Amino acid sequence: MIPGGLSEAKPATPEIQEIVDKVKPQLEEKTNETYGKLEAVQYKTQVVAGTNYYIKVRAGDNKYLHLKVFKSLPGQNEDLVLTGYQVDKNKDDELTGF
């Protein structure tokens, strides 16, 4: 199907959305939409061998970003990893959510 980090994930936390203001200090005040889509979109959680994370970031209605935070630690513990990473404008443009 096309689940946007559903089930195990919340709607833009005060933490994940803060990331949209750190590495996305433009994508967070650029869409300048008249709604609440200027921040994180949501973050799902799922182990793996360090704890995978899916940070789908929100950039408004026309802009959208995305990330996958992963604390790589499969027994060897060799730094983290982020198989996810995206800007906005219309790349993560995906209307997901229950």
From Swiss-Prot:
Tissue and organ expression note: Expressed in the skin throughout the epidermis.
Motif interval(s): Secondary area of contact: 46-50
Site (Reactive site): G4
GO CC entries: cornified envelope; cytoplasm; cytosol; extracellular space; nucleoplasm; peptidase inhibitor complex
Subcellular location: Cytoplasm
One example GO MF annotation: protease binding
Record key words, sorted: Acetylation, Cell adhesion, Cytoplasm, Ichthyosis, Protease inhibitor, Thiol protease inhibitor
GO biological process: cell-cell adhesion; keratinocyte differentiation; negative regulation of proteolysis; peptide cross-linking
Keyword Membrane assigned: no
Main location: cytoplasm
Residues bearing the modification N-acetylmethionine: M1
Family: Belongs to the cystatin family.
Physiological role: This is an intracellular thiol proteinase inhibitor. Has an important role in desmosome-mediated cell-cell adhesion in the lower levels of the epidermis.
Connected disease: Peeling skin syndrome 4: A genodermatosis characterized by congenital exfoliative ichthyosis, sharing some features with ichthyosis bullosa of Siemens and annular epidermolytic ichthyosis. PSS4 presents shortly after birth as dry, scaly skin over most of the body with coarse peeling of non-erythematous skin on the palms and soles, which is exacerbated by excessive moisture and minor trauma.
The protein's name: Cystatin-A
Species of the source: Homo sapiens
Gene: CSTA
